[PDB]
Symmetry: C2
């Protein structure tokens, strides 16, 4: 590329998820909404990925979903999370080899803080990481130095 900003853009475009992921926080689908909330504060995350008895991705839960559940008219804190989780038709994943910038674009478009990183297996998607707006914020800071 011809200018220093173009060289910066080219490098940013090559960054891969495998290098900029966080550890994932995963709960089983039959854990209660209350237990999910406790896990969120225990682990200090704002998103949880939900898996089945084979540890395959079945759902995602955001802090907003849990607040909604907790404050509403129905008693939902006692129910299994699979009642309230976002399901697979509506879940976006990414893989280790994908580009960080393409994931950032998804975060912004889908108005969500985190995506799961998965590995394809014969049983479905195994969760191996998380990439978040916080990860992106860290990349931005690092640019200013080196």
């Amino acid at each position: 590329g011809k200018t220093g900003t173009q060289l910066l853009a080219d490098k940013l475009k090559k960054l891969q998820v495998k290098d900029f992921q966080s550890i994932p926080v995963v709960i089983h689908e039959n854990v209660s909404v209350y237990d999910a909330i406790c896990t969120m504060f225990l682990e200090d995350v704002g998103t949880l990925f939900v898996v089945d008895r084979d540890a395959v991705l079945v759902g995602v839960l955001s802090r907003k979903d849990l607040l909604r559940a907790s404050i509403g008219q129905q008693e939902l804190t006692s129910v299994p999370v699979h009642i309230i989780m976002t399901r697979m038709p509506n879940i976006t994943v990414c893989r280790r080899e994908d580009y960080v910038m393409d994931i950032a674009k998804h975060l912004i478009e889908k108005q969500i803080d985190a995506l799961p990183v998965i590995k394809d297996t014969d049983k479905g998607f195994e969760v191996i990481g998380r990439v978040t707006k916080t990860n992106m914020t860290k990349i931005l800071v690092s640019l200013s130095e080196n």
Copy 2:
């Protein structure tokens, strides 16, 4: 390459703000949760009778309050809000890299942008980890200087 890095640190908040959402300090916790879903934002800025900033309330704090046992239809937000020793503000003239660092340490999604007036801190913007993420995307597309 230092010089490029020196340019990045010169980018300012005014160019990468969002819309702030404000609530009065006497609103119930239930009413503030309602505002948070209506507005679809994750951080509320609390003001006093004089429209002066007195606190902040994140979605986390509201979840903390809701999975508790107080009559939150009763409880005014001043009871649980983070108060004005422990709040980090910024101004439109501040540098985005500075703010980004504060968002990271403090582990919060948003800071209030305020103006310094005759009356005190008046709220004029919000800056978030989404804003920072949008900057990173713009840089990757060569859409800034």
